[PDB]
Design a protein around this ligand. Structure first.
Ligand code: GRZ
Ligand code: K
Ligand code: K
Ligand code: ZN
Length: 401
């Protein structure tokens, strides 16, 4: 069974931010327009019975002072007065500025994603669902005491913490950007293995997930977490097939060696060829019998491990809905076995006009370094397995590449 996080108030809050606008409404309404909702179990966002319980949940990762400042930022933006000099300094000390500004619902908006992803983790733990989707979540850049990349609270870190505290988790980050906040949270933890594939290049946000400065080294975790943070930075312009071939054997080898209890996938849509970043050239194409995204999700779901699928980046809202609608239909198909039939034409619904001018489900796109990374990653995986007394066929894994 496949769950999906939704609710009336949740939708309103997920649509209340200045950067992401009504994206979540387009996503859920396109899923609904394609008649997928009856196949999915609604997972209600988590609520608490007191402010103390909410604070206890969020400060399992974030500092109390950061959570206080974020709540104060919302309060200050609900009045018409400007911030005092001292309040500006306070907000700047948590990077609550620039690309992470305040707005009247900023705390409720950020908290909603946490509520959604925590409920999704719980649904997996109690075996209510085999997969849960949360397209309102996936905010991988937020740090313990710092907003980053329009991520204010790290719903992913909190969801993973709930999963491990119930056990190994494999986290897979498909966003265009490095999953730095999740990687940092579990830097010292061998039980949460993180793997991000992303673009990296000089000056490109957030800057990590690649060689860093003698001669540059690839960091991969620390303490008992040594070798437990994996990264695959890729040059711009990569297409569906090359991205699939780059990530495929890594994913299979991580699953073989780690044998995760849970998989958490961040599925940010900014690798699409039609994202305004214009960096990678992935699609949402799906042969009627191939999108890098759909390739990766189908492979992960074939492992039959309880899986959380989250959203993330994606600044072309209709094309993000086009992709996540196909991910949703694929999840139903792989988990249930029930074939899912999706018309090539966008169905009439509230946001139909946003899919002009051609109103198709396919996005409007005409389609050695990696060998070195594979050897480095395969070596790190062996080192990880040696440090953690795990054993595996050091030949069947090698064969995968
Ligand atoms: O999605 C993200 N990470 O997961 C993410 C993306 N940025 C980001 C960083 C810089 Cl310096 C500039 C624009 C950024 O976003 C965009 C890019 C294009 C756009 F049309 C709308 C938003 N920051 N975080
Ligand atoms: K990524
Ligand atoms: K780790
Ligand atoms: Zn991104």
């Amino acid at each position: 069974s496949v769950g999906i996080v939704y609710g009336d108030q949740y939708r309103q809050l997920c649509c209340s931010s200045p950067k992401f606008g009504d994206r979540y409404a387009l996503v859920m309404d396109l899923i609904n327009a394609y008649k997928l909702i009856p196949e999915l179990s609604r997972v209600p966002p988590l609520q608490w019975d007191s402010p103390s319980r909410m604070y206890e949940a969020v400060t399992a990762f974030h500092s109390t002072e950061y959570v206080d400042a974020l709540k104060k930022l919302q309060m200050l933006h609900c009045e018409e007065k400007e911030l005092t000099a001292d309040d500006e300094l306070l907000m700047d000390s948590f990077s609550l500025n620039y690309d992470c500004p305040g707005f009247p619902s900023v705390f409720d908006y950020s908290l909603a994603a946490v509520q959604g992803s925590l409920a999704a983790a719980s649904a997996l733990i109690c075996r209510h669902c085999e997969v849960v989707i949360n397209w309102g979540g996936g905010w991988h850049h937020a740090k313990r005491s710092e907003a980053s990349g329009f991520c204010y609270l790290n719903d992913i870190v909190l969801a993973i913490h709930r999963l491990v505290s119930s056990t190994r988790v494999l986290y897979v980050d498909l966003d265009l950007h490095h999953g730095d906040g999740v990687e940092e949270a579990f830097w010292y933890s061998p039980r949460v293995v993180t793997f991000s594939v992303h673009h990296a290049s000089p000056g490109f946000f957030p800057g990590t997930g690649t060689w860093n400065m003698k001669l540059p080294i690839f960091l991969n975790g620390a303490g008992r977490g040594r070798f437990s943070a994996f990264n695959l930075p890729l040059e711009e312009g990569i297409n569906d097939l090359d991205w699939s071939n780059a990530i495929g054997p890594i994913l299979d080898s991580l699953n073989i060696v780690i044998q995760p209890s849970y998989v958490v996938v961040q599925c940010g849509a900014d690798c699409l060829a039609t994202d305004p970043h214009r960096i990678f050239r992935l699609t949402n194409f799906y042969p009627n019998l191939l999108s890098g995204y759909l390739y990766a999700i189908k492979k992960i779901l074939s492992w039959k491990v309880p899986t959380l699928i989250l959203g993330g980046g994606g600044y072309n809202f209709p094309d993000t809905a086009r992709l996540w609608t196909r991910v949703t239909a694929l999840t139903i198909e792989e988990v249930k076995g029930k074939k899912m039939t999706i018309s090539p034409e966008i169905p009439e619904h509230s946001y139909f006009s946003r899919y002009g001018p051609d109103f198709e489900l396919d996005i409007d796109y005409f389609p050695d370094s990696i060998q070195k990374h594979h050897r480095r990653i395969l070596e790190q995986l062996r080192n990880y397995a040696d440090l953690n007394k795990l054993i595996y066929d050091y030949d069947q894994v090698y064969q995968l590449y």
